[PDB]
């Protein structure tokens, strides 16, 4: 019951901070809802969050759309076409986010 009430209060508060972000970002419903669930799970269980593992990763930035993005890739490798997923090493274990 202590855990349940902690989770209930956490979600009850996060709702009122998330409506403004829901209005500002209508397409980010999934990400914000997942983040709220993660914060509630922090409240009820207590595993600290990873700032780099719960932060949006910019992929492309659009300046003005004119001209349209001309991406000439003369070295069409799988890492350079579809993107690369980098890893950190912690004493020999390969972690990523």
């Amino acid at each position: 019951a202590l855990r349940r009430l902690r989770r209930d209060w956490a979600l009850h508060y996060l709702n009122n901070r998330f409506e403004p972000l829901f209005q500002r970002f209508p397409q980010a419903r999934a990400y914000l809802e997942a983040l709220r669930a993660r914060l509630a799970r922090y409240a009820e269980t207590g595993e600290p969050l990873d700032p780099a593992q719960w932060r949006p990763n910019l992929l492309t930035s659009s300046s003005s759309g004119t001209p349209p993005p001309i991406v000439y890739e003369p070295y069409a490798t799988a890492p350079r076409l579809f993107g690369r997923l980098d890893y950190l090493v912690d004493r020999g274990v390969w972690s990523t986010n």
């Binding site: 902690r6 901070r17 972000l21 500002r24 922090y42 969050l49 719960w54 932060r55």
Partner: peptide, 23 residues
């Protein structure tokens, strides 16, 4: 950018989440 500051603030909200248990 706006989503970035929003997410940064939400991540910083951990201190307030800890405080809320003393309400």
């Amino acid at each position: 950018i706006h989503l970035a500051e929003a997410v940064e603030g939400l991540l910083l909200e951990v201190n307030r989440l800890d405080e809320l248990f003393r309400q």
